[PDB]
Amino acid sequence: MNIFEMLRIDEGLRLKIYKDTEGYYTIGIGHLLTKSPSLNAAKSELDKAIGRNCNGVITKDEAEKLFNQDVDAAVRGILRNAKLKPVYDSLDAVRRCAAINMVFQMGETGVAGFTNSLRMLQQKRWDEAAVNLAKSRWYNQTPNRAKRVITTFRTGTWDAYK
Numbered sequence: 001m002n003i004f005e006m007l008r009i010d011e012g013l014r015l016k017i018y019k020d021t022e023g024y025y026t027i028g029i030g031h032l033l034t035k036s037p038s039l040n041a042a043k044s045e046l047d048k049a050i051g052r053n054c055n056g057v058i059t060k061d062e063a064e065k066l067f068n069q070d071v072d073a074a075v076r077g078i079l080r081n082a083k084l085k086p087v088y089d090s091l092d093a094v095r096r097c098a099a100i101n102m103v104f105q106m107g108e109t110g111v112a113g114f115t116n117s118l119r120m121l122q123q124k125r126w127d128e129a130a131v132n133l134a135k136s137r138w139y140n141q142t143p144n145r146a147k148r149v150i151t152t153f154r155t156g157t158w159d160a161y162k
């Protein structure tokens, strides 16, 4: 298992524009296009991202390239953030994947509310961090996804994905 296989399981693959769990236009392996309600705005964002007139549909190769770009961007966001980088650097490789997963889903701003969880993770208080992470809108809105990610933080294993 690696970060790409983990996120592919959590996000799935769709080659036509779809709506995510919050109702936002998305394509590929969880690539957010826009938070605007306008399908035309989403199609414009798609064409700009891919570099051709897609009319709302992409190829599997295109989805996989967007996905590589999005994972790279999540990692770079962690490394440039003075609050996230020291926590990330303290984690083992499996728990680092759980961190990337959360940033991929919620972005740097979405993780800003997890300040107490970050401190517990840096101190390697895994059970306490797991409870704190579950006290969140994230866990209440996408509980199965959150349970897999939290279990990965708690155990440092891939058991929730196997």
Ligand SMILES: Cc1ccc(I)cc1
Pocket (backbone or CB within 6 Å): 078, 084, 085, 087, 088, 099, 102, 103, 111, 114, 117, 118, 121
């Ligand atoms: C919630 C969370 C976000 C970033 C890191 I690094 C660890 C935990």
Ligand SMILES: [Cl-]
Pocket (backbone or CB within 6 Å): 141, 142, 143, 144, 145, 146
């Ligand atoms: Cl879920």
